[PDB]
Every structure is written in C-alpha cells, then in structure tokens.
Design a protein around this nucleic acid. Sequence first.
RNA 1: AUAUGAAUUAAUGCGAAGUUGAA
RNA 2: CUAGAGUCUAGUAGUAUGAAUACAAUUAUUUAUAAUAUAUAUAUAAAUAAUAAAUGAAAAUGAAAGUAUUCCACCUGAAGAGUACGUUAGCAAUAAUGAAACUCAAAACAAUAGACGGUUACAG
RNA 3: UUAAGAGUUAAACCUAGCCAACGAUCCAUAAUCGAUAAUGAAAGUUAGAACGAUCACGUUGACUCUGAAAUAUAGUCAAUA
RNA 4: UGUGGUGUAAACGUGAGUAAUUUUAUUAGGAAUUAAUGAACUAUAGAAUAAGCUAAAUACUUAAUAUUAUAUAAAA
RNA 5: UUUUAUAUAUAUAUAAUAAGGAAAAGUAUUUAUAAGAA
Lengths: 155, 53, 121, 56, 43, 143
Amino acid sequence: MSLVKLANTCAHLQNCSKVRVALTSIPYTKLQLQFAYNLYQQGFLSSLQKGSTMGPDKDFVEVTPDNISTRRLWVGLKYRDNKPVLSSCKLISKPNSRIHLPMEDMKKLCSGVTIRNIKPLQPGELILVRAHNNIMDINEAISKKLDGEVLCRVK
Amino acid sequence: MSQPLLRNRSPEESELLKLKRNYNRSLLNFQAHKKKLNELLNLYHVANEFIVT
Amino acid sequence: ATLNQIKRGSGPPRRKKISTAPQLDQCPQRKGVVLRVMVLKPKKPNSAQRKACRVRLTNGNVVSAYIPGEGHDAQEHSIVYVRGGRCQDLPGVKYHVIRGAGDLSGVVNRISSRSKYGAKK
Amino acid sequence: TPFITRIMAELKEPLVLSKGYNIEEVDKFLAAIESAKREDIEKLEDRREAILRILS
Amino acid sequence: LRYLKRDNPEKYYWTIQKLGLNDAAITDEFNMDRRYMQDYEFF
Amino acid sequence: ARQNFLGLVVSQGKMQKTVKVRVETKVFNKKINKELFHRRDYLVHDEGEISREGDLVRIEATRPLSKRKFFAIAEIIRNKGQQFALYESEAQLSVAKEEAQKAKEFLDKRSVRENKTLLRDIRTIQDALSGLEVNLEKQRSLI
RNA sequence: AUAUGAAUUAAUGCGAAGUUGAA
RNA sequence: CUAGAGUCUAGUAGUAUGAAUACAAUUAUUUAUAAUAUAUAUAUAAAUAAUAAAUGAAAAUGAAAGUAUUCCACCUGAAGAGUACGUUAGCAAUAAUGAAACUCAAAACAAUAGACGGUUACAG
RNA sequence: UUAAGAGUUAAACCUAGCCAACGAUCCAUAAUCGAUAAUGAAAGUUAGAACGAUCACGUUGACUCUGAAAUAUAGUCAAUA
RNA sequence: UGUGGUGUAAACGUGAGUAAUUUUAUUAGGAAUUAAUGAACUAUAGAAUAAGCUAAAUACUUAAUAUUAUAUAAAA
RNA sequence: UUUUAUAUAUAUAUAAUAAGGAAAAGUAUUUAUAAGAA
Ligand SMILES: [Mg+2]
Ligand SMILES: [Mg+2]
Ligand SMILES: [Mg+2]
Ligand SMILES: [Mg+2]
Ligand SMILES: [Mg+2]
Ligand SMILES: [Mg+2]
Ligand SMILES: [Mg+2]
Ligand SMILES: [Mg+2]
Ligand SMILES: [Mg+2]
Ligand SMILES: [Mg+2]
C-alpha cells in the first residue's frame, strides 16, 4: 500500500510511455493490481497479464508465498496515432502530505474548485480515490458517498 | 480484486518445506564433513615425513 | 525546500517594505526648525547648485530637506514643515520642505502646478 | 560477564583442534585407518602428535 | 537489540543480561567519544 | 463527556503517584498544507502506581490535583512497560540458573578430559588383532 | 536591568576634480 | 602554539555537482564471468566514448544536471561584512556564531559579433 | 481558609523533581476578538477608529466594611498636585 | 438644612497595565460532582409576636415562633 | 495445445490426431477564475 511504490509505478509508466515500450511490468500488489485494473477499464492500458520477473506467465500459476517475491503484473501500453494514450501520471497525495477528502470536497474538486491546493478535475482526466482499501474512480466514489483518500491523476 | 491475493500455505506444506530446507542445509554440512575428513586423511597419510622428534 | 524545512521556517523572501522617510516616525509630515541653509552640488551627470536645509524636527531627530521652487525664503531658525521624498541627484537629502507653510512662502509668480508650490489664485 | 568468560576459556583449553576438528573425531578416524590395514609404535604416536600440533 | 526489545520483550532482557548489558546501554545514544574512553579507562 | 486521551507513558517513578504521558493529536497546517501530528506531555495522576514506562494508557480529565496535574490514569490499553519490568526481574535470575549449570558442565568436561592414554590400549588390542551422515540418511529417508 | 546624554574614541558609506602605484 | 619528558612524546585546535530508493533507447569498444562447438562476429553484467529522447538561460548533462519518491544542509540585489559588538572555547594565537545604519540602481552568469594583447602560430 | 479543586494563600512533614534548541528563563512591544473595516483570485495579510463581544482601569499602591458578587470611581492609610 | 427607605457592582469614558499566575477566541468540554447566596420579577402557600434604645418609626439592637449529618433499607 | 500409438528405462524419444461461427428493425444547469510594464 506504499505511496512510494505507487509513485515508483507512476514514474515507471511515464518513462515507459516516453520511450514507447509496448509491454512492461509493475509490482504484483493489490494496490498496484487495483490501479492497473482501473486504468485498464478506462482504456489507458491495453491489457493486464500475470507473470514473473522474466516475463508473462505461459500457464496459470497459483499465487503462494513461495513465488510471491518474483511475481509481477505485466501491463501493455497503448499508443494511438503516434501518441501515447497514457501520456502522463502523477500522485496527488504525496507520502509526506496525504490528502483525505470528504465527499463534499470531492464534489467541489470535480466541479472546478481547488481544494487543499489540488488542481481540479479536467475533462479528459482520471482521478483515483482509495476508500476502505478499495481503489475507485472519483466519480464512483462520489456516487457511493464514500469518504476516501485521493491518490493520483493520470491524464 | 475482492478475492485474497495469495493462498496461504497449509501447515502440512509448512512441515514439508521445513524438511526440504533442512535437507539442503544438512547436505551442505555433509559435503563439508567429507572434505574435512579427506583433508585429515591426506594429512595423516603424509604425516610420516614430518619431523616432530 | 522540503515540507519540513518549509515548516521549520524556510520560505519565500519577505517582500519587506522599509520606510523611505524613517525620521518622520510614520507621520505624513512633521514640523521642524531650520538650523542652517546649505547649497550643495548633486551627483554627476547632473550639475547644479541645489538648496537644502538642516532641520531639527519636533520628535527630536535631525534631517536634511530639499527646498523646492524657484526662490526660497528660508533662513536659519525658520519654522518649516517636512514631508517625505528624496532629492534624487543629491545623496543624503531624504525629505522635502513644504512650500506655503511655516516660514516658507509659495513660489513667487508661480502659475502652473500652483498647489505643489503653495501658490494662490 | 560469565558467558564471555566461558567462551574465551574454551579457546584456551589444553587441547582443542582448529578448522572444525575435535579430538574425539580425529581419534576415531586415526584408529579406523590403523584398523583398515589389518584386513614401530613410537612412530605412529609421534605422527599423531605432529597431526595434533598442526591443528592446534 | 532495540528491535529485539520491540519484537520479543522477554528474550530481549534474557539476552542483554546474558551478554552483560543493561537496557540503558542498548537504549541510549552511544559513540566512542574519547571521553567515553577516559570514563571507562578503555586504553 | 470528560476529556479522554490516548497516550504513551514516558517517565515513571521519578515522582510520587504521578507519571508523564505523551499525547499525540492530528491538526491541519494550512501553511504547509499537511495533516501533521502534534505532541504534548501531560502530568497525569497515577494512584496505585500501576503505570510503567512504555505503557499505552487512556488518561481522563479530573479535578485539579496539583498546579499542573489535571488528568488521571483511566485504563491501561497495553501494559508493555509492566511486561518490561517483570521480564527484567525474571531474567536476572533466569539467566543465572543457566549460567550456573553451564559452569558446572564446563568444569565437568574439564575433569573428564583431566582423567584422560587409550592409544596404548588400542595398540595393545590391535597387536592381538558419521553420526551426522546417519542423521542425513534419516532426513532423506523421511523425505 | 530597561532607557536617555556624554568629553575620549573604532569602523565604514558617499561625493569634487584629481594625485600616486601597475595588483 | 601549549604542557610532560632529553631535543622527543602527550597534546590544544578543527580549517584550506549531499544521501538513499524505482525507472530510463542505441551504438562502439573494452572488462568479468557463464556457456556452446579459434568459432558461435556468443549471451549476461560493470567501465569507457559518441549519441537519441529528455532537461537546461545556455555552455553543457545524457544512466544524471533525466523521469519520480524521501531526509538533511544551504540561498534571497551590490557594497558595508564575514566587518563591529556580545558570547563560546582557547594561557594566548585564532576559531565558531554574526548583525545594523548609510550609499546605489545596479550587480552577475552563458553565449554572440568585434577591436584588442609582448596571445599563439601560420602564411601572403 | 472558601459555597467550592488546587503550593492560591498560611503552617507542618516527606520525595527530587518540573520547564528547555519544536526555544525555556529574561528582555522589548501590545488591550483581545467578530457574522466589523481594508485588500487579494484565494490561502491569507493589515487595522482593532466606527457597529458589536470580552477584559482592565477611573491620579498611584496596599488593605478593610458591606455584600451573593468589590482589594469598589466606596472607606482607612500613604504617594503626587 | 432633623431620623430614615431605594439608586450610583450599572451606564459613560479610556486602553495605562496585561505575552497570560486569573487575559481573549473555540468546545454539542468538564467538577470540586459549586452554598440550606436572590440580587429582582413570576406562580404558589403561609406568617407578620414581644421588649428595649432613639424625640418617633418601615432606623437600630435582644428575644420568641416557622438543607446537610447520622442510621435502616432499596436499587443500579 | 490436448489425447492416444510404438519403442526404451511411473517416466523418456519419436508419429498421428484441433472441440471455440453469432447474423434483425426500433428502443442545458459544466460551475472557481490569478494579465503585467520600465
Ligand atoms: Mg499598552
Ligand atoms: Mg496586534
Ligand atoms: Mg491597553
Ligand atoms: Mg472599537
Ligand atoms: Mg474615538
Ligand atoms: Mg478599580
Ligand atoms: Mg485625570
Ligand atoms: Mg487604582
Ligand atoms: Mg464598573
Ligand atoms: Mg427591617
């Protein structure tokens, strides 16, 4: 659940996009898995695969403590019309200053107001909020009236 | 995402894994024991030539 | 620089405003008495014979004040009123004597910017 | 500290062998080799002594 | 040994007593400043 | 209700029936835009002297009990300081028994070696005439 | 101690046209 | 420079491109291993050089002066000034901490074209 | 003693503590604040005149009576004029 | 202009002191778990006696009549 | 891929074999708003 690991993942995706690599890997943790799934469902990532450090898994493998150390989540990146779909990725809640917003301030952020010096939501943008150990889009978090921590911003 | 990420090992698996790891460690000890005994064997073989008297 | 360093005291430099008329102790003007009237040469490139006076104020400080206008009627021990403003081409005269107050009269035969020079019409 | 005393005493015991060896095991191995030939006493004793002096 | 204190309080005191140390020695800040050597006559 | 705080005991026994409890709260610093913690040390009343340094406790507001002591110990959330005290007291002698028997064993092996020649005996019988390996074999067999 | 004045006294800022060295 | 010893020892004193983590396209050399049968113009790594993208005021950097995270130290125009005073240690020397008023619209950095130099050579 | 806790004040006896480089103690300065005023895009910054809320004082210091509540713009004593 | 009752703890003005040892701001904050205090009105009941001293009294004195601490239980 | 077949010592080397094909028409409020010059 480290914001440090998530920040490292965000920078890794940015770098992978800038050099135009089709397939890369990230740590296989539930925060990373939920993050990758939310990016993928919104069309930012081409595909998710299970794998090891060497590469994606050929056949299905059970996840146990024996192999957990070398497990990796292989994300495939989308490049459309000679441009990267996942152009940029940022962390709103830094490990120093963590931003836990109530639902009203999330509505304000989605409505264009700057709360706690957070630049509000933009049209083509995606903001992720973790509530009670589940990652979800900020719009859905508002839809479920869930208080949560705002994590990141991928544009 | 709802399901647990990893299936924790049952205690039977824990015991079996203990057996494997102890086998590895004891095998290393066994090799080292062979080597020390062989070195002692060669030392005693040639100890005729050494001069203690 | 870092959030803790910012917290511990570091930050943007204070855009501090110091007074350009310190001896007026945050007053628009102050009354004063002219000890002597002195003629001084400004810093070059400018060349002139500029009229200034040494003034003891009512708060007790002593200042140097430029006497504007074509003609000054100020002698020693005259009563004057001093406002802020420095003679730019003369170092050390940080104040302006008011014309039309105390023993300083309005500029004679002044017809434009009369208010600044104490003239009447 | 009693623990340190015992540990540092074990080093200075009258006869303790190095490199992972102990007197009992070397004795067993020497006697075993001596037996092996079956299927002058002075020389074998001083040979043993030289071995032990080597490993002290 | 500080970590041992946090993890296993019993084994920690067992260990510091066996090795000849009070909790004060482990817990406090220590450096071999020469004043330490003068205090305990290290040389 | 009466003010209740959760804290950690820091100083105990320096005083009579009084302890010091470190209390931590959350506050929003607008200047740095951070939800940061703030610390304060409360002089708290301990009656019964059931407090030890390193205990997590709940302190509750009371009448003024001294110039600076307006709180009293309410509940020991965790008694880890008491555990430390007990374990110290136990260890001081628990190690001692093991040390004594260790010394006995060490001197006993000294004596056993002191009794120790058999190369003479072994040779006399020849004139008329690995355990770890077996343990490895056991481990392999069970595996 | 907080101030206010002080013979005696330390340093430095400016400017006038210059004077002297060659760092 | 100070003490003890017969010149030595023991000293006082403390001057004269931050660290870590994740990631980041090539080429060419080497370098160290791991192989397979000198050949696979062998793969895996680190060192060196030129790059790409990226960054930068540029020079230039180019696996870092790049993308990100965390911790610390430091800077806030020039001069006054690392000065004065006070304190801190020191027999002292010195060191550390360290201002203020006044004066000015300056000052500085990289690079561009120039004329300049006993600056270099080279020619006509 | 008080209607009432408390080294608040007075008495007695114990313990050695408490605060402090996230700045004590000391010094200088200041009445404090708002749904008040000024300003800014805002965070904030400034003022505390005016409207309103709280405190302190009624030439200076201490004490006393009354009283539920006062060291009262009261009384006594002293200081200054 | 004699004896008495009520009123001047308010309001008015000021910002000296005050960096908190009692000040200001805030809390759906507390207890010691604040008095047989009503200060001045409301709604209810009752009572309003005797002497003295004042020149006299609704002035003053003296006297008459009208919650807490115990003990027993009950609960929480 | 999978399943079997032969051979060899439950396993190994070889040969063959592959189940994923569906069609249908019609069914605004967008929000707060930060400029520089010599
Ligand atoms: Mg004041
Ligand atoms: Mg103020
Ligand atoms: Mg005031
Ligand atoms: Mg006001
Ligand atoms: Mg007014
Ligand atoms: Mg008063
Ligand atoms: Mg007056
Ligand atoms: Mg008074
Ligand atoms: Mg009043
Ligand atoms: Mg009456």
